[PDB]
């Protein structure tokens, strides 16, 4: 197999009978001036949730909805590697964006689960379900080229991937390929886990490439906003050549819509090489080389 | 003082109003085959407990004494460096051996702690086991069992961390005495340090039930030290050599015995020489139980 799916597990816990964990730590990781708030939280699992890199867990926020029923679960990409941020395999971490926005009528909408999570305090209980998913599992090839394209909280599965690849010691996995992370955020105050990625860059300079795309601050030579695709375009030649290799796996995670901008740049890249990107993407997708997990 | 006591903090929290931390992790570090159990645990401190290498913290175990009052605090050498295992200055770690002699109250309470549970912390406590200020000093550490704790704290700052104001470039020599190989606390960390700083760190283990000297005698800590008699004595004659001893009360005896032999060669009386070292802050002892 091309992905690390050895004895994968899903749905050990269901919303009917969730696993009840406890918040150990909860930290706001964005600057006070960022457009929105993003928090990194660590939950105890007693090692009962058998998740792996790339999977998500469901969270059933406390309370009840308008029709007196428990809230439906919301999915969150796991931000920690399989062994957790403590390295003891007894925790799971999430990277949560507090959903708050004002509509056209001037009404403020506060997302139920995201605010519940960002409001959690050490010691409080949290209902967990899962693990969930297999679409974003890591490549099995330890020498593969792994291109990670994320926006906002989309960084989560990539933080999971990268901790295993560059910080952990495993008997059956020693990464020696090329990992390239592109992370798009609106402001520098919205950068997530930069300190961690910089450490990885210093530990493995030849196996890890790191590029941030701060859209409301940075611009390319022509003065265009630096969206993730805009940064990618600055490495058009390098990226296109990598995309033609069978050992190159691309992953995309984040807010739905980021997909359109990336297609635009890819359509141009392929075209210059006389290739139809739409068709090429289908090929990559079937070959398990184009993995997408975007959400509204 | 010759030790790192600048802006030192002691007794910020008292048993009357302890700091309430939370257990982040608790793992048994002794092998299943070891005769006893020793656990490494980490508590969150929100950075409210400004301790430093060599200090201890008190723990008021949950429960009541025979009169229904709170338990008296028990002291534990901090096993983590000042910035903690996670380098954010927001955690503290302990190395605790489960005591049975009846079940020891605090040691068993601590080893039973589960992630998420609260723990009452007092301190920081102590100034006796602080590190030398001289970054090029020779630091000899002699420990038995959990006595390894303050030395783990020392060594993490010396070899696992980068500090603009502190770059250790002297000689750190650790001697650790334990009963079995399955009781060699933090073995992997020390071996990593030796691989990282081969010229600044020396490491010697003394496993009493598995090793013996050329004379067939059990390899206690003093038995291993005796194999470096000449080297150690030469180091003990230098003004930049600081010795630290920590562990179970009684480990001092065997060490003095081999020392008398050392000093004897130079027409020196060990007991009095050790006293001059102690008063010069070069012989620091913290033994318990």
């Amino acid at each position: 197999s091309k992905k690390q799916d050895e004895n994968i597990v899903v749905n050990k816990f269901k919303p009917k009978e969730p696993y009840v964990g406890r918040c150990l730590l909860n930290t706001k990781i964005t600057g006070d001036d960022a457009p929105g708030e993003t928090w990194h939280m660590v939950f105890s699992t007693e090692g009962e949730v058998p998740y792996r890199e790339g999977q998500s867990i469901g969270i059933v926020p406390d309370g009840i909805d308008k029709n007196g029923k428990p809230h439906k679960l919301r999915l969150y990409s796991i931000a920690s590697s399989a062994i957790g941020d403590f390295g003891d395999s007894k925790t799971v971490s999430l990277c949560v964006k507090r959903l708050v926005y004002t509509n056209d009528a001037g009404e403020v909408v506060k997302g139920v689960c995201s605010n519940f999570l960002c409001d959690l305090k050490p010691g409080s209980e949290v209902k967990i379900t899962g693990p969930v998913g297999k679409e974003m599992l890591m490549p099995k090839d330890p020498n593969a080229t792994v291109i990670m394209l994320g926006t906002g909280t989309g960084i989560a599965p990539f933080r999971s991937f990268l901790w295993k690849m560059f910080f952990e010691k495993h008997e059956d996995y020693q990464f020696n390929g090329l990992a390239w992370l592109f992370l798009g955020v609106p402001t520098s105050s919205s950068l997530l886990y930069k300190e961690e990625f910089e450490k990885m860059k210093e530990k493995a300079p030849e196996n890890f490439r790191l590029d941030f795309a701060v859209s409301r601050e940075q611009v390319n030579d022509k003065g265009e906003k630096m969206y993730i695709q805009t940064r990618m375009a600055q490495y058009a030649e390098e990226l296109w050549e990598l995309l033609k290799k069978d050992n190159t796996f691309v992953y995309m995670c984040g807010l739905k819509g980021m997909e359109k901008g990336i297609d635009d740049i890819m359509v141009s890249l392929a075209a210059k090489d006389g290739i139809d990107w739409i068709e090429y993407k289908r090929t990559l997708k079937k070959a398990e080389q184009w993995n997408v997990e975007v959400y509204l | 003082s010759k030790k790192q006591d600048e802006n030192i903090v002691v007794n910020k929290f008292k048993p009357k109003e302890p700091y309430v931390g939370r257990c982040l992790l608790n793992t048994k570090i002794t092998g299943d085959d070891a005769p006893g159990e020793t656990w490494h645990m980490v508590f969150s401190t929100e950075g409210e407990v400004p301790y430093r290498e060599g200090q201890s913290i008190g723990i008021v175990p949950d429960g009541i004494d025979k009169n229904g009052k709170p338990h008296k605090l028990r002291l534990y050498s901090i096993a983590s460096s000042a910035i903690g295992d996670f380098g954010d200055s927001k955690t503290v770690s302990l190395c605790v051996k489960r005591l049975v002699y009846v079940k020891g109250v605090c040691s068993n309470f601590l080893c039973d702690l589960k992630p998420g549970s609260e723990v009452k912390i007092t301190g920081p406590v102590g100034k006796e086991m602080l590190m030398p200020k001289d970054p090029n000093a020779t630091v000899i550490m002699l420990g038995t069992g959990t006595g390894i704790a303050p030395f783990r704290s020392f060594l993490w700052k010396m070899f696992f961390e980068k500090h603009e104001d502190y770059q250790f470039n002297g000689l750190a020599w650790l001697f650790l005495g334990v009963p079995t190989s399955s009781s060699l606390l933090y073995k992997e960390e020390f071996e990593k340090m030796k691989e990282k700083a081969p010229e600044n760190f020396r490491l010697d283990f003394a496993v009493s039930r598995e090793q013996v000297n050329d004379k067939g005698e059990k390899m206690y800590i003093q038995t291993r030290m005796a194999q470096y008699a000449e080297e150690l004595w030469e180091l003990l004659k230098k003004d930049n050599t600081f010795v630290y001893m920590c562990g179970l009360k009684g480990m001092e005896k065997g060490i003095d015995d081999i020392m008398v032999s050392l000093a004897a060669k130079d027409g020196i009386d060990w007991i009095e020489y050790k006293r001059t070292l102690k008063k010069a802050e070069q012989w620091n002892v913290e033994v318990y139980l």
């Binding site: 730590l25 990194h40 390295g87 910080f167 300190e195 | 996670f86 993490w156």
Partner: peptide, 26 residues
């Protein structure tokens, strides 16, 4: 099989946590 770990962070290359579980803000 490999011997049981006698240290708490043997899961990491450097034998210590690689970063804080309370990430630093930008």
């Amino acid at each position: 099989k490999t011997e049981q770990p006698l240290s708490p962070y043997t899961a990491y290359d450097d034998l210590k946590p690689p970063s804080s579980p309370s990430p630093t803000k930008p």
